[PDB]
């Protein structure tokens, strides 16, 4: 039978990161839960830190509900994102409504591969008046790289996400890149992205994000288990401004099971 | 019925100082006693955070009737269709979205029936030509290279100095050919001579067509056999009216 | 008898520098050889480093051949620079031809002193179409400073090279400044420059290179032997960008004999 | 007519944190399709001063009628005289002063005609016995080891836990045997089974004879084939009334 | 014909080292010269540094003269060391006399290998009254290590000099270890040691010097050329005092030709 929705072959995808501080370090946890059919059912964010001599844990939950050709994603703040899905279970449009009654509308378009798996090529954000406010386009033409174009109001930026030829890592982890959920407007759809509602992740892990040039490259180093599934990602941001280099590192631990 | 390399191993080692911390890269090509490439191991050594990292990936090469099947650890299967002389005429592999990517190859056939790559064309799943590289051998001391990637076009000349030509007894390809897209996707097939024979003389300069050119100069060290032990690559660059050259040093173990 | 060519009273001028690295430091050697008549006959570049546990030395040689009113300089890559000399042996024009058949043309003009020694005042580079692509002009009007104007395509920059009044060091070493062979297009003629084919070096050593102003000054400190001949040069580049100073140091050892 | 290893490669990798800067050590043993050891490559990676260092040395193993000749890059020739079953009975090599050093070996012969080393004796050029190691297999779960180096004598017991024995399908020797003088001089011959078969079960403890013993405990990780992927070695040590244990972690690639 | 003296197959063995300072660094050079027969003929020590802005070079020369069964070594200070040699050209005794008329006497004993090459096993120093003041003994029994016993008056210390099994480097450079000429009383005979008058160096390079235990290990890392001859030695001294480690590094460059 042909599939009617994208699936994740895991029951849980969990990310853990320490957000550094010389006074109050915070451990952030992002937990994505999938049902036995492989659809995302919910997301829980957690922040853990010490205050006085006591450990505190702050939680926020996002719910995912499915209807015929629809995914309804509701966060802790009461914002409802309604995704209209095609026959294959990928969103073609989204309407987001906050508790103040403000709305945002999005369209999505895809590359459809030989197996009928969909890969996001375009996210466009419109305003109430129908004015296009932002977009991200992804081009899969380069054999081992993704060409990314971003526009946020008057800001425009192009970048390339690369996989090393001869050193490719298969994305059997089925995870998105760390940078993708931080890019506006995809940053508004992180829960839909981990649920594959906005398309499949690339078939190989990305090891470099190169913005167009002052230069600011991101390098990703992965640790895998004996199944070839990601256990951690080391991200190194190298920012250069007229021969002055400042390096920032992130370590994200993964529990994919 | 097939091209051969008279060595059992071709290994490249390089310290890359370009990154925050220096990375050591190793590229090892292994050949069987018949002279056919059987495998490739790519290695990277560096530290990331507290963790010392050693990334090691192995690609296998299998030969069938008029075929070379190149399989990596990521599960990519690249199938090269070979002609009667053992050089690829076609290649199918899988892209970032899992679609089939097709490559065609055409050659210069010399008097000794040795094939030299003249054209690599890359076609997308819809049949659209995405990129090509053409090589003109009219003057062996000045190879005319045309590259087209999407809408962008780059022409360059690869030269050998008249009277100071070094015989390529090492049977190695130039450093620049495995960095030029789409040939940069076929480094394993290139070192296996599946995509043609390397230049008969070592190339000492890569000159782009002109602006004060960002030319690459190659300097080689040879052993007592006349086989390459190291290559120094200098890319000239002008920054605020001053020469600021980028350099690479690659050590070779050819045995 | 009046001289027909410039001369260097040494048989060898050799520069040695360590190009720093926390993994693969490289020792670079630049050797200029002069015949007993004092004309430059050749240049050898050498790079020495460790790979594994073995020392490697990479060499490149440039040849200098003389004919009536001509100097032909050929590098390791096969590029031929043909200098047309005046009656005093200084180049008035140069044509450079690479192995791909690309050509570059240059004109040179000079200050002629009371002893008929020539000091470079202008290098102009033209393109095939006759379009002026770059130039460097040197003014010797200030008693103890050189005023330098550089143009490379659309880039324009002015700088001053100074000698300290009361602390002058006679240039009996007959060497050019370190910065002169790094400035484009003089950087294309380093072998001709050390051979005095492009003029005499200034009579006193330069201790400061001050570009016009973000500021980026170079200071030179020399060590001499008991003959008053240079044995080393310490070059300190001080780059300032809105109160943020980054200092870069070079040590070049000289063997002038 | 000779012992065999059913793998083509046995590789050990270790990060040594004992030194000022961490050293990465690699020991690679290669076997031919017949199962005989053909060579060894020892590698060390570290930084010394500004220079990143990579020391790499290769030892070759050649077989002749009733002989195994082990040659290193330093020009040492170690000649092992083999019996009819392919195990060494004698060895001649060259010491620090260039004198011939002689070793004799004797074995336990099991029911399947497999040989297990019981004695290694080292003799100086004058014929003086300088050292020996004897191994008693009376109890396979508690091997009695006697070592004598000059005047100093050390007795220890190598144990396997009753009911929790791991089959040595990996065909690897213990980590401690190639550290025990004079067996520490014959690591290449040991991995080639030239000096006998390894223990049928992995050894989990090395207990010296007693004082609160400086015992070594080995913990192994196996893959789905039951072949070793890593070994963790813990040496217990008491310093000012506190436990201060020394640890080693060795990763294995047995294929 | 059987040899009557030890030989070095080089004409020069030269060591260069920078003795660090944040004010007046000194470059020290130790040059050992051998005649075409392979006997040491002389030693020159050189110290080079900057004072003011001038380079200064301080030199001291030691002469080596040979007679039947004798080597006479005279330094810059006028101290004469007379070595009595055996039939193979190795010293069995030495008498040293300074300009004040003070004398020191030494005996030497050796391991004689199958090729009749001699390796030092014992140096004993006596006083005028015949009282043994110091000794160094070297044992070659361990296949890949040297066991060293030292006694200087009431001070006694044992150490082990090791070669790594499976990673041996042949001593085709024919050089002694760096530590051997720093150990008293062998430190009084450095010129005789480089001339092989006090025996052959070990057949493999030493990579570690381990004193008996507070611990103080020396590690040696060598760089070789394509002939397998030493070009440099990196020596790292690791001193530990109750969990407090202080590391000292030396880099000695070699010119062996
Ligand atoms: Cl951009
Ligand atoms: Cl072009
Ligand atoms: Cl300006
Ligand atoms: Cl005991
Ligand atoms: Cl002691």
Instruction: Residue count of chain A, please give it.
Output: 257
CA neighbor of C128 nearest in space, from C103, C92, C96, C97: C103
Instruction: Give the count of beta carbons closer than 10 Å to the beta carbon of residue E186.
Output: 23
User: What's the A239 CA to ligand 1 centre distance in angstroms?
Assistant: 16
Q: What is the distance between the alpha carbons of residues E149 and E136, in angstroms, rounded to a whole number?
A: 6
Asked if A203 lies within 8 A of B53 by C-beta distance, the reply is no
| Residue-by-residue DSSP string for E144-199 | TEEEEEEEETTEEEEEEEE--TTS--B-TT-PPPTTGGGSTTGGG-HHHHHTTTT-
Rounded to 10 degrees, the C-alpha dihedral B88/B90/B92/B95 comes to 100
Can you say whether residue E128 is alpha, beta or left, with left for phi > 0 and alpha for psi between -120 and 50 degrees? Answer: alpha
D223: which 2 tokens? 């893959």
As beta bridge partners, residue B90 has: B81, B104
Q: How many CA atoms lie within 13 A of A27 on its CB side?
A: 10
Angle among Cα B95, B98, B100 to the nearest 5 degrees reads 65
Can you say whether residue D127 is alpha, beta or left, with left for phi > 0 and alpha for psi between -120 and 50 degrees? Answer: left
Judge whether E54 is closer than 8 Å to chain C, CB to CB.
yes
Q: Say which DSSP state B19 is in.
A: S
Q: Please count the structural domains in chain C.
A: 1
Ligand nearest to the CA of B153: 2
**What SS3 state is found at C3?**
coil
Name the CA radius of gyration of chain A, rounded: 19
CA neighbor of E2 nearest in space, from E106, E116, E148: E116
In angstroms, the Cα distances linking E94 to E23, E175, E183 are: 41, 22, 17
- For residue A72, the distance in angstroms to the closest alpha carbon of chain B comes to 27
Of A146, A164, A251, the CB nearest to B96: A146
Judge whether E60 is closer than 8 Å to chain C, CB to CB.
no
User: The domain containing residue A172 runs over which residues?
Assistant: 1-257
In angstroms, the Cα distances linking D134 to D85, D120, D130, D183, E31 are: 21, 7, 14, 11, 50
Of D96, D130, D150, the CB nearest to E144: D96
Query: At a CB cut-off of 8 Å and minimum separation 6, what does B77 contact?
Result: B69, B70, B71, B93, B94
Do at least 3 CB pairs under 8 Å connect A with E? no
User: For chain D, where are the alpha helices, taking DSSP H only?
Assistant: 187-191
What is the bridge-based pairing of β-strands A70-74 and B228-235? unpaired
As beta bridge partners, residue A122 has: A109, A137
Q: What is the distance between the alpha carbons of residues C6 and C71, in angstroms, rounded to a whole number?
A: 12
CA neighbor of D209 nearest in space, from D155, D160, D159: D155
**What SS3 state is found at D187?**
helix
CA neighbor of E131 nearest in space, from E161, E104, E149: E104
C93 and C105 Cβ atoms separated by less than 8 Å: yes
Q: What is the distance between the alpha carbons of residues A215 and A246, in angstroms, rounded to a whole number?
A: 11
As beta bridge partners, residue D125 has: none
B123 and B129 Cβ atoms separated by less than 8 Å: yes
Of E111, E143, E167, the CB nearest to D57: E167
Taking contacts as CB-CB distances below 8 angstroms, the residues of chain C near D54 are 51-53
| Residue-by-residue DSSP string for B76-95 | -EEEEEE-TTS-EEEEEEE-
Phi then psi for residue A94, to 5 deg, are -145, 140
Owner of token pair 């290694």: D120
Q: What is the distance between the alpha carbons of residues A85 and A67, in angstroms, rounded to a whole number?
A: 10
Q: Say which DSSP state C204 is in.
A: B
D50 and C20 Cβ atoms separated by less than 8 Å: yes
Instruction: Residue count of chain C, please give it.
Output: 257
Q: Say which DSSP state C192 is in.
A: H
- The separation between the first and the last C-alpha atoms of chain A, rounded to the nearest angstrom, is 26
Asked if C226 lies within 8 A of E50 by C-beta distance, the reply is no
Exposed e or buried b per residue across C92-112, where buried means at least 16 C-beta atoms within 10 angstroms of its C-beta = eebebebbbebebebbbebbe
For B186, the closest chain A residue by CA position comes to A165
Can you say whether residue E173 is alpha, beta or left, with left for phi > 0 and alpha for psi between -120 and 50 degrees? Answer: alpha
| Residue-by-residue DSSP string for A111-145 | EE-TT--EEEEEEEEE-TTS-EEEEEEEE--STTE
Q: How many CA atoms lie within 13 A of C237 on its CB side?
A: 11
Q: What is the distance between the alpha carbons of residues C175 and A52, in angstroms, rounded to a whole number?
A: 68
- For residue E54, the distance in angstroms to the closest alpha carbon of chain C comes to 5
- The separation between the first and the last C-alpha atoms of chain E, rounded to the nearest angstrom, is 26
Resolution in A: 2.3
Handedness of CA B193, B196, B199, B202 (dihedral sign): negative
Taking contacts as CB-CB distances below 8 angstroms, the residues of chain C near D56 are 52-53
What is the bridge-based pairing of β-strands C245-256 and C230-240? antiparallel
User: What's the D203 CA to ligand 4 centre distance in angstroms?
Assistant: 19
Helix (H) or strand (E) holding C251: strand C245-256
Taking a contact as any Cβ pair under 8 Å apart, which residues of chain B between 112 and 141 contact chain A? 122, 124-125, 130
Q: What is the distance between the alpha carbons of residues C161 and A85, in angstroms, rounded to a whole number?
A: 70
Judge whether A251 is closer than 8 Å to chain B, CB to CB.
yes
| CATH code for the domain of C240 | 2.40.160.190
- The separation between the first and the last C-alpha atoms of chain C, rounded to the nearest angstrom, is 26
| Residue-by-residue DSSP string for B203-233 | --EEEE-------EEEEEEE-TTS-EEEEEE
Of E54, E55, E224, the CB nearest to C53: E224
C105 and C188 Cβ atoms separated by less than 8 Å: no
| Residue-by-residue DSSP string for E29-54 | EEEEEE-TTS-EEEEEEEEEEEETTE
Taking contacts as CB-CB distances below 8 angstroms, the residues of chain B near A164 are 42
Q: What is the distance between the alpha carbons of residues B27 and A172, in angstroms, rounded to a whole number?
A: 25
Instruction: Give the count of beta carbons closer than 10 Å to the beta carbon of residue A80.
Output: 16
Query: At a CB cut-off of 8 Å and minimum separation 6, what does D191 contact?
Result: D5, D10, D29, D37, D40, D173
Q: What is the distance between the alpha carbons of residues A164 and A168, in angstroms, rounded to a whole number?
A: 6
D13 and D249 Cβ atoms separated by less than 8 Å: no
CA neighbor of C150 nearest in space, from C84, C215, C226, C211: C211
C42 and C33 Cβ atoms separated by less than 8 Å: yes
Taking contacts as CB-CB distances below 8 angstroms, the residues of chain C near B199 are none
Helix (H) or strand (E) holding B136: strand B129-136
Q: What is the distance between the alpha carbons of residues D73 and D70, in angstroms, rounded to a whole number?
A: 10
Judge whether C225 is closer than 8 Å to chain E, CB to CB.
yes
Asked if B96 lies within 8 A of A145 by C-beta distance, the reply is yes
For E117, the closest chain D residue by CA position comes to D97
Rounded to 10 degrees, the C-alpha dihedral C47/C51/C55/C61 comes to -30
A61: which 2 tokens? 């939950």
Q: What is the distance between the alpha carbons of residues C186 and C176, in angstroms, rounded to a whole number?
A: 12
Query: At a CB cut-off of 8 Å and minimum separation 6, what does E124 contact?
Result: E106, E107, E132, E134, E135
Query: At a CB cut-off of 8 Å and minimum separation 6, what does E207 contact?
Result: E162, E163, E164, E167, E219, E220, E221, E222
| Residue-by-residue DSSP string for chain A | ---SS---S-SEEEEEEEE--SS--EEEEEEEEE-TTS-EEEEEEEEEEEETTEEEEEEEEEEEEEETTEEEEE-TT--EEEEEE-TTS-EEEEEEE-TT--EEEEEEEEEE-TT--EEEEEEEEE-TTS-EEEEEEEE--STTEEEEEEEETTEEEEEEEE--TTS--B-TT-PPPTTGGGSTTGGG-HHHHHTTTT-PPPSB---EEEE---EEEEEEEEEE-TTS-EEEEEEEEEEESSS-EEEEEEEEEEEE-
D214: which 2 tokens? 């400086």
Asked if C244 lies within 8 A of A243 by C-beta distance, the reply is no
As beta bridge partners, residue E10 has: none
User: What's the A183 CA to ligand 1 centre distance in angstroms?
Assistant: 14
Interface partners of chain A (CB pairs < 8 Å, 3 or more) are B, C
Q: What is the distance between the alpha carbons of residues C141 and B128, in angstroms, rounded to a whole number?
A: 65
CA neighbor of D157 nearest in space, from D210, D205, D106: D205
Q: How many distinct helices (H) and strands (E) make up chain E?
A: 1, 16
CA neighbor of C248 nearest in space, from C210, C216, C212: C216
Taking contacts as CB-CB distances below 8 angstroms, the residues of chain C near B142 are 99-101
**What SS3 state is found at B187?**
helix
Q: What is the distance between the alpha carbons of residues B93 and B80, in angstroms, rounded to a whole number?
A: 9
- Burial group, residue D249, by CB count within 10 angstroms (0-12, 13-18, 19+): middle
B174 and B209 Cβ atoms separated by less than 8 Å: no
What is the bridge-based pairing of β-strands E26-34 and D205-208? unpaired
CA neighbor of A162 nearest in space, from A148, A181, A182: A148
D232 and D249 Cβ atoms separated by less than 8 Å: yes
- For residue A168, the distance in angstroms to the closest alpha carbon of chain B comes to 6
Judge whether D243 is closer than 8 Å to chain C, CB to CB.
no
User: What's the B248 CA to ligand 1 centre distance in angstroms?
Assistant: 28
């Amino acid at each position: 039978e042909p599939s009617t929705y994208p699936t994740t072959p895991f029951s849980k995808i969990e990310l853990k990161e320490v957000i550094e501080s010389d006074a109050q370090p915070v451990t952030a946890t992002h937990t994505y839960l999938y049902n036995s059919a492989g659809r995302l059912t919910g997301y829980t964010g957690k922040q853990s830190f010490t205050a006085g001599d006591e450990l505190f844990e702050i939680e926020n939950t996002t719910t995912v509900e499915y209807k015929d050709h629809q995914a309804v994603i509701t966060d802790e703040a009461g914002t409802v994102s309604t995704y209209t899905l095609n026959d294959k279970g990928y969103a073609t449009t989204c309407t987001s409504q906050d508790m103040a009654g403000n709305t945002r509308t999005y369209t999505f378009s895809y590359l459809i591969n030989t197996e009928d798996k969909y890969y996001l090529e375009n996210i466009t954000e419109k305003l109430d008046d129908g004015k296009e406010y932002s977009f991200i386009t992804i081009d899969y033409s380069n054999f081992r790289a993704l060409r990314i174009q971003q526009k946020v109001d008057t800001f425009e930026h192009n970048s390339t996400a690369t996989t090393p030829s001869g050193n490719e890592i298969a994305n059997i982890s089925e995870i998105p890149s760390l940078f993708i959920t931080d890019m506006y407007p995809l940053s508004m759809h992180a829960v839909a992205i981990y649920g594959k509602i906005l398309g499949e992740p690339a078939n190989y892990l990305i090891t470099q994000l190169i913005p167009d040039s002052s230069e600011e490259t991101t390098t990703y180093t992965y640790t895998l288990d004996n199944r070839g599934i990601v256990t951690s990602c080391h991200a190194v941001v190298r920012h250069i401004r007229n021969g002055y280099e400042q390096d920032y590192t992130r370590t994200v631990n993964y529990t994919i099971e």
